[PDB]
Amino acid sequence: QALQKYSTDLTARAREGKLDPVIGRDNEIRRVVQVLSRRTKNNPVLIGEPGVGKTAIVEGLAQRIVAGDVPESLRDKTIVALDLGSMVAGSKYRGEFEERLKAVLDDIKNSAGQIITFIDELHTIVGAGAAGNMIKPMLARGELRLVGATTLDEYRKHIEKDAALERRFQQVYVGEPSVEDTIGILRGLKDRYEVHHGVRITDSALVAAATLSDRYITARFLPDKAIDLVDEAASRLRMEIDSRPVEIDEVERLVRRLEIEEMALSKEEDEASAERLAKLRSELADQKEKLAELTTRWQNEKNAIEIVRDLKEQLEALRGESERAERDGDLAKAAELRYGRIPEVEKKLDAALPQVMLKEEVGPDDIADVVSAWTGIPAGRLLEGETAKLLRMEDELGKRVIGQKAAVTAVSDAVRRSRAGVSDPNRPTGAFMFLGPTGVGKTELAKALADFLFDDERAMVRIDMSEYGEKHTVARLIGAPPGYVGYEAGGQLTEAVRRRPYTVVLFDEIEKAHPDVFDVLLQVLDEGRLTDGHGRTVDFRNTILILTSNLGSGGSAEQVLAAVRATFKPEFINRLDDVLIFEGLNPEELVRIVDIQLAQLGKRLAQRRLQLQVSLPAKRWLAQRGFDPVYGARPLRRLVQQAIGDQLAKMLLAGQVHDGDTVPVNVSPDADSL
Amino acid sequence: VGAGADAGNMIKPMLARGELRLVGATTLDEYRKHIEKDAALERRFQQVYVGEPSVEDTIGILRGLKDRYEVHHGVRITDSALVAAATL
Ligand SMILES: Nc1ncnc2c1ncn2[C@@H]1O[C@H](COP(=O)(O)OP(=O)(O)OP(O)(O)=S)[C@@H](O)[C@H]1O
Ligand SMILES: Nc1ncnc2c1ncn2[C@@H]1O[C@H](COP(=O)(O)OP(=O)(O)OP(O)(O)=S)[C@@H](O)[C@H]1O
């Protein structure tokens, strides 16, 4: 009675069909049976990584027994799964727990060879005492079966430490299934999710949800890292087929919130607030417009679907009538229906029939959208709005960087070549090095690129190679070996990519580092991974590595290349993408930097409503004064500051330039007045 | 992970079957220190990365929360101040 009291049957649940299909894994069940029905050491223990499927095999064996496909001496066994969590509970006296264990063991002893005990998470029996050692006597006679399943490391962490027991067990290895076996298991399990949710599931989806989740989720194992995607896409589609679909359910909520905020911002007795109120209304209206446009779209197709349906119904009614005409022998209506009314409505149906958005089944891209919500990595289809930004990318980078089209092109052509699903999948999404004279942009372009993709300049992982001067500093970006002072901290680079692996990495002044920090970027590049202290393996197959330097600084093109081939390894300059070289600024190009800097300054002193008004000779002199062709565009910034900001501050903190003003600037013989 | 002395371990069966719904919240760098050690457990969990907002939306959050403090402290708060309390 103790068995039915504490433990729980498994074959009884199998009889009610409460288990899931167990597609595949015949070799492992064969091995488990041929080990279980042995004479001695009749105790199998399943060993495998978490997620490979280790309880599923035992459920499959239970199904096989209840079906009757097992060898001779395995008929009507009634496998039982223990529960020590329920066994040791409220047994708060000296002689209760071991007594209950003795009772269970004796009730198992009674049944000669029927009961096949099963313990999931076998490692829980190493303690449980204050005991748990009343298993060696029974296993010393082969009186139990006791199939168990644990993970790989907990085995050597809780059992191998007790090498007496490990002698009495027989190991079975369970490796992860490959992509085809995973597709098979998914095609087997599709039905249960189809019935639990309320939607259909195609097969191209079951193929994509297996080929993707092996490439992107590099932390789990197939039989579940593939199931999760489908089981999330199904629920998303059910929620969509409920009240209004996604991409409307967000615009509506943004519009309502904007209306609420404006309804109380309007009643403000201020002047600073009177200008921020003039943009709130603008955006609210410009989004009301989009909500209206989107609403009509989904509202129609809706009607079209209903039309089609009606036409189907009508058709069928006529078909039923042609049957009847033949039942009644009515020729007048017989063919009138059979080649008149029926094909008439059929054609009408067919004409409306082509009538996307929320079709009614999880396509091959809902899985991709789920994977994109996961891991932040976007793998979609260039949904007709981003394919315009990815064409204006160059002209848009031209808003912050000027000139250097030779580099802006080779930077842009490294993103579309990955969006179009073309570039190699085992290499970073692009890793190339800038080098040239100082003050040209080789750091500003990396910032402009890292903002084109995230809209916040601080979201790029950044490490300065000017500190890593010796070997022993390499451990700063990889963590520390096992068992040292700083070990619960991990690395500094690695940890910024193991979370949100879509960032953009920037190595500043690569040549200032010790030529052993170079020796880890060898396997960073051209393979896209490295191993930190804890043995983990992060994956750079989606990052965009960028490197800057200042080598040579004087050569046309061959002296800088000589410096590179002398200070870099051939097997390290052989892995990179195009090695771009910048040109330098010209007396013409400086005006388009001058006006950018002046707009920057106007935006800076704009929180106090203090816009400027610059003159044409002012800009021309300001560009023709600071130009020297050795320090790039920094002297221009210094000159702007020293020539405008100091006079402006002198005038400002002496009154007379109070808030809400606009001062004009004009040229005097050498300096410029205000 | 604690409570033991075989604890937070009797919940592994019920988790993998979806019986009890679980909703949690742990800071980003104690996860990898107390959970990812036990990958047998963190398999059962679905991660939801929560990135920090920007100033333009912090403005909105403050505009919504203003009235909750207006009542607590018997004062009034300017929107030109709710903007500065985020830009600054
Ligand atoms: N061969 C298979 N046939 C059908 N479903 C499978 C198969 N292998 C795995 N699965 C499914 O994939 C999941 C596997 O989860 P489990 O095997 O219970 O995890 P586990 O293998 O027990 O790992 P631990 O150590 O218990 S965390 C379940 O949802 C199973 O239904
Ligand atoms: N091509 C450019 N376009 C716009 N601003 C630029 C450009 N080159 C330099 N600047 C300005 O100069 C600063 C950026 O200097 P950078 O050239 O990026 O420094 P750097 O590229 O790291 O060069 P070094 O050799 O490392 S000092 C910012 O204040 C920019 O406004």
Residue A311 in contact with residue A348, Cβ under 8 Å? yes
Which of A46, A276, A279 to mutate against chain B (most B CBs within 10 Å)?
A276
> Which H or E element spans position A8?
strand A8-9
Q: Which residues pair with A464 in a beta bridge?
A: A508
CA distance A318 to A79: 59
Distance from CA of B25 to the nearest CA of A (A): 16
CA distance B25 to A274: 40
Strand ordering across the sheet containing A170-173: A8-9, A80-81, A117-120, A147-150, A44-47, A170-173
Structure tokens at A387: 């394919």
Q: Is A23 in the pocket of ligand 1 (CB under 6 A)?
A: yes
CA distance A151 to A53: 10
| Count of Cβ atoms closer than 10 Å to residue A348 Cβ | 16
Which of B32, B44, B76, B87 to mutate against chain A (most A CBs within 10 Å)?
B32
Structure tokens at A548: 């800057």
Alpha carbon of A444 to ligand 2 centroid (Å): 5
Ligand 2 atom at minimum distance from A437 CA:
25
Q: Is A445 in the pocket of ligand 2 (CB under 6 A)?
A: no
Residue A65 in contact with residue A74, Cβ under 8 Å? yes
Residue whose CA is at the smallest distance from ligand 2 atom 7? A441
CATH class in words for A7-173: alpha beta
Inform me whether the C-beta atom of residue B3 falls under 8 Å from chain A C-beta atoms.
no
First to last CA, chain A: 99
CA distance A421 to A379: 9
Cα A234 off chain centre by: 18
As annotated, the binding site of A for ATP includes 48-55, 436-443
Which of B6, B33, B65 to mutate against chain A (most A CBs within 10 Å)?
B6
Method: cryo-EM
| Count of Cβ atoms closer than 10 Å to residue A281 Cβ | 13
Alpha helices in chain B (DSSP H): 12-15, 28-34, 39-42, 55-72, 79-87
Instruction: Using alpha carbons, select from B29, B43, B37 the residue that is nearest to residue B1.
Output: B37
Distance from CA of A21 to the nearest CA of B (A): 15
Residue A624 in contact with residue A586, Cβ under 8 Å? no
Documented resolution in Å:
3.7
| Count of Cβ atoms closer than 10 Å to residue B70 Cβ | 12
Residue whose CA is at the smallest distance from ligand 2 atom 26? A438
Task: Provide CB contacts within 8 A for B6, sequence distance 6+.
Answer: A84, A85, A124, A127, A128
Instruction: Using alpha carbons, select from A56, A50, A59 the residue that is nearest to residue A154.
Output: A50
| Count of Cβ atoms closer than 10 Å to residue A550 Cβ | 17
Could you tell me which chain B residue has the CA closest to the CA of A270?
Answer: B80
Distance from CA of B80 to the nearest CA of A (A): 6
CA distance A508 to A466: 7
Q: Which ligand is nearest to the CA of B17?
A: 1
Please give the C-alpha separations between residue A397 and each of A394, A529, A642, A652, in angstroms, as whole numbers.
Answer: 5, 29, 29, 35
CA distance A590 to A622: 9
Residues in chain B: 88
Could you tell me which chain A residue has the CA closest to the CA of B41?
Answer: A50
With CB atoms and an 8 Å threshold, state whether A265 touches B63: yes
Residue A644 in contact with residue A625, Cβ under 8 Å? no
Q: Is A51 in the pocket of ligand 1 (CB under 6 A)?
A: yes
- Strands (DSSP E) found in A151-289: 170-173, 200-201
Residue A206 in contact with residue A187, Cβ under 8 Å? yes
> In this structure, are strands A672-673 and A666-667 parallel, antiparallel, or unpaired?
antiparallel
Instruction: Using alpha carbons, select from A121, A153, A122, A47 the residue that is nearest to residue A534.
Output: A153
CA distance A432 to A254: 40
> Which H or E element spans position A622?
helix A616-625
> Which H or E element spans position A567?
helix A558-567
3-state secondary structure of A150: strand
Cα B2 off chain centre by: 21
Residue A208 in contact with residue A254, Cβ under 8 Å? no
Q: Dihedrals φ, ψ of A462, to 5°?
A: -135, 125
Residue whose entry in the numeric block shows the structure tokens 């960073």: A524
Running DSSP on this structure, what letter comes out for residue A268? -
Inform me whether the C-beta atom of residue B63 falls under 8 Å from chain A C-beta atoms.
yes
Inform me whether the C-beta atom of residue B36 falls under 8 Å from chain A C-beta atoms.
no
> In this structure, are strands A544-547 and A504-508 parallel, antiparallel, or unpaired?
parallel
With CB atoms and an 8 Å threshold, state whether A85 touches B60: no
- Strands (DSSP E) found in A460-556: 462-464, 504-508, 529-531, 537-539, 544-547
CA distance B41 to A290: 45
Inform me whether the C-beta atom of residue B57 falls under 8 Å from chain A C-beta atoms.
no
Task: Provide CB contacts within 8 A for A462, sequence distance 6+.
Answer: A505, A506, A508
CA distance A479 to A492: 7
Structure tokens at A288: 């009301």
CA distance A374 to A392: 28
Q: Chain A interface residues facing chain B, Cβ-Cβ under 8 Å?
A: 50-51, 84-85, 120-121, 124, 127-128, 151, 154, 220, 224, 228, 257, 261, 264-265, 268, 270, 272-273, 276, 376, 456, 488, 490, 495, 499-500, 607
Cα A523 off chain centre by: 23
Task: Provide CB contacts within 8 A for A351, sequence distance 6+.
Answer: none
Residue A149 in contact with residue A183, Cβ under 8 Å? no
